[PDB]
């Protein structure tokens, strides 16, 4: 085999960090794709002297022509209006469709992430045009989500942030559905430290609302986020190159569980060399299922307005 | 501050691949220490050689003599007789006796590891003559134990073995307590998995036993456990050196968790700069207890006949 | 040792890059400090969520307060204004007198890397008014400038990037000194590649034009340099806080290399715990001194703007 | 591609500390196959748990059939008798001869790399038994050899091992060609550094004659050469797996270099994804090409004895 090709369709903010990371883990030849003529080629650029630094040797080049998706092993999706926000969704469903229609062409074996908001939607309109299997594509929404909850409990409890687990599922934005009742520190439930007194139930309130608030937060610090949504998906991607079989909670199609069906939502799923090699369905109960279909339920409200335009 | 100075008491086969994987891993200097003349010399030499290949810079020296203990950072402890079982427990008690009045004299703030066996024993006898703190020592035990427990589960599951979570304590041997309720496989509740018949109690309970016996399923392969306990090893270690405040299961200094006081037994703890920073204290019930009790008793058993040789 | 606290001075997108390897490499503590109120908060915050993903645990602060460098281990300066350009030689100056003035204070024992262009003029000026000692500080330059040589080669002849080593000296910036006669591809001199004309003297001179203006390359690609920038500044970090002791060719005091005391230029220098541990003085022939002259005389040309606004 | 699969035919050291190697660095399910009754399965299991350590998830498992070669990407040979020395040559080269058939059968896409001694000699005779294109195999030595030379060259000047770049061909043992003129630190030729005093001709003689010596030195200090021979055939490993190009001094077929055809011997090569890509000839001056004879001469001298048993 030769290296994997990854291509990133948008070379902004997140591009450019999943570009930094490629070359950083030697994961693979990097193609940044947009439409802004010459950008990705300078960032291609920039980030190419990294290969020294890190001794690596992935090439990273830009494009400005959708049939370099050609031969792609992985495609990321980042392309999309992101400034009502209701009023986008029909603009992004034309890029979704455009850009489907080129894998369709050009890699339909291809692996595809997608990021564009809102990304539970954004991922089946993909699905659709694209044609590729069902195992074969997600939307990031849950690594990322699920991030800042384990960071946060892990600041608090000073332990290693990797070793707080949890699950946030249904949808990626602010109908995230966050499960106490699966969280844990090193393997123990969360339960185990509020007993103890060393996290409080008032705190952890605290800290789900700042999980959903994050992007928010950020934003009115003036910054962006895009490191961390960088992060996650290079996760997600590595899984998949690797085989390495991970656990890891991203937007897929479901076929029954939770009791929904042609629709995409945000579930532990195992990624490895075949894609989406297992969907994990949680046994929740009637509290967390009632949630869950508002997730669902927004989504597809979404979905509805994406089709057309109206004058 | 320069780098780290880790001093490895017993060079013997677990002892070279601590120095393999200190070097891989850039963590610090190695002193390579063993009775034995020459020996120690001539693996750290070929063993020095790696940091060409690694990219690291560590040195790696052999020693003979025990004041190179001096200015130890990190102590880890592997010499001791091996080759019934309970005869050379007061040999090995010596053994740490002499190794624990050089710490003292030499590196009274290290950190120490202990190994030899039976560890939850020898550890305690390591504490009391080293005169360590209590936070400073702590032996070998659950990260080696449930990275098989772990490893088997998630081949069966087919997920990343490091998704599955697991507990194991009381000792480090044949009383082990592996405490099935507290298994996670991405963070979810094993008994999900169970509910779904994707592994079955049966399977689970010849997981566990082949976990107790694992050494000795090795031993009659005509090989012998010693890549695995490097490797838990120097996971602890690289815990404390990084501060990265893992928990790990690791042997310790009980101070009336699980009804237990003035003996060591393994239990989670939070591994970081300060050494142990952390006791977590499992949230047990009383068939769980009645286990941990077993183990306990017999640590108190081994350690009595310790003390003393007789005609 | 608790971990490196490593202190930004400058949280632009050289900053946020440098930030997010830090913690990709579990480096230490990152503070992001600048004057704009927040931002520096928010870049933090969602770097802070890749522990995670990274299985580290670095804290990542943003801080608008310059006593926050207090017990600093590393600090690194990309504070300046960017935007004829001379004009901004006595502004830029007054920034390194002021974060002078605060590591002086704050964190005298600091090992300093100054990236602020032109970076030869403007860490004499921070050397001075900070008080470190020569072996302390160090400007960016070398790293970057043979990451691009470096790796051009190496696409040519297609070969490992970190396998083509080149040296570029006396300045970062229009006038550095590119040294044909020291670069190799695989430790073999790069001469006997063009004797087998695998690479000519032509396509050499285009690669060396290519290399001294890759930053207008970039830009006018409407992209701009800070990925390779941050990454070449934390293999120096790197290289002291490990004491890995790499040769590194960067901007240090001289004190009699290449004829030239009392100002900095670049040059191989070996990087480890004490800091600049060697300052290596290339053996250059009479030709390339000349060059080196060239490229001190401009760096003292822009220091003797530096000093005073004008009316 | 699902992950490769890497057979280690010879489980024992050498073979241990690969294995061991591959997990760490998650590069491909790994088969241990020995000759030897069950051993390699006890390896097998012991290293498997150590993928919970490393965040890996390669399989390790043990063979005692040839056919387990199937489908195998590289294939690494250590194999074959150690305890004169050229009486071994006839029963080894049995070795390699069925070996070889099995590689034909089973693998013959395998990239194959030979450990067993005298290397030069048993990398051509499972060449020509093995059927596999030139490009396609090659013999350990000169990584080894080097990783010795530039690492005591490193501890003179103290600088980072890896920066120290050097060349040693011909023949991997005694008849080695340590090449003075080819020996740089931080890419600047060695004599800068012999002219500056900071280490002598004298001092590099006997640094020589150490790394002509140290597989006997470290024999003399009862202990034995496997952790640096891992070490170096994993990285040629990885080369070829992860297609990073690097130039790497391997045993290979000549065609004319040096003047030399139809035989094996050391020489810088570039190994990529399409095995052995360039064969690299040093430009060598009569005295380097005297020595370079009197190595192939050797190699020949075993191979004329290595094909037939005496009575």
């Known amino acids: 085999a030769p290296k994997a090709k990854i291509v990133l369709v948008g070379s902004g903010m997140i591009g450019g960090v999943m570009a930094t990371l490629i070359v950083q883990k030697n994961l693979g030849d990097v193609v940044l794709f ?36 050609a031969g792609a092993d992985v495609v990321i999706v980042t392309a999309g209006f992101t400034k009502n926000r209701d009023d986008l969704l029909p603009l992004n469903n034309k890029i979704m469709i455009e850009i489907g229609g080129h894998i369709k062409k050009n890699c339909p074996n291809a692996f595809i992430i997608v990021v564009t908001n809102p990304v539970d939607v954004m991922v089946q309109l993909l699905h659709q045009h694209s044609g590729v299997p069902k195992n074969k594509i997600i939307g990031l929404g849950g690594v990322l989500d699920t991030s800042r909850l384990k960071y946060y409990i892990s600041q608090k409890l000073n332990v290693c942030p990797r070793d ?16 106490k009742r699966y969280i844990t520190v090193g393997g123990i439930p969360l339960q185990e430290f509020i007993n103890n007194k060393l996290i409080s139930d008032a705190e952890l309130e605290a800290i789900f609302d700042r999980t959903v608030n994050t992007a928010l937060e950020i934003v009115n610090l003036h910054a962006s986020p ?13 899984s998949y190159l690797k085989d390495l079989k991970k656990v890891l909670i991203c937007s897929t199609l479901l076929e029954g569980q939770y009791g929904h069906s042609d629709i995409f939502g945000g579930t532990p799923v195992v990624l ?4 989406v090699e297992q969907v994990i369905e949680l046994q929740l109960n009637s509290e967390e299922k009632a949630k869950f279909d508002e997730a669902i339920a927004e989504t597809k409200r979404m979905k509805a307005l994406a089709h057309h335009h109206h004058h």
């Open 34 to 69: 947009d439409i802004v003529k010459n950008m990705p080629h300078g960032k291609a650029l920039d980030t190419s002297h990294t290969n020294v630094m890190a001794y690596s040797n992935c090439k990273v080049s830009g494009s400005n022509t959708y049939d370099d998706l």
């Open 164 to 179: 707080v687990n949890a699950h946030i599922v249904g949808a990626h934005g602010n109908k995230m559905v966050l499960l």
């Open 226 to 238: 895009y490191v961390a949504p960088a992060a996650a998906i290079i996760e997600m991607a590595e």
């Open 272 to 275: 490895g060399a075949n894609g």
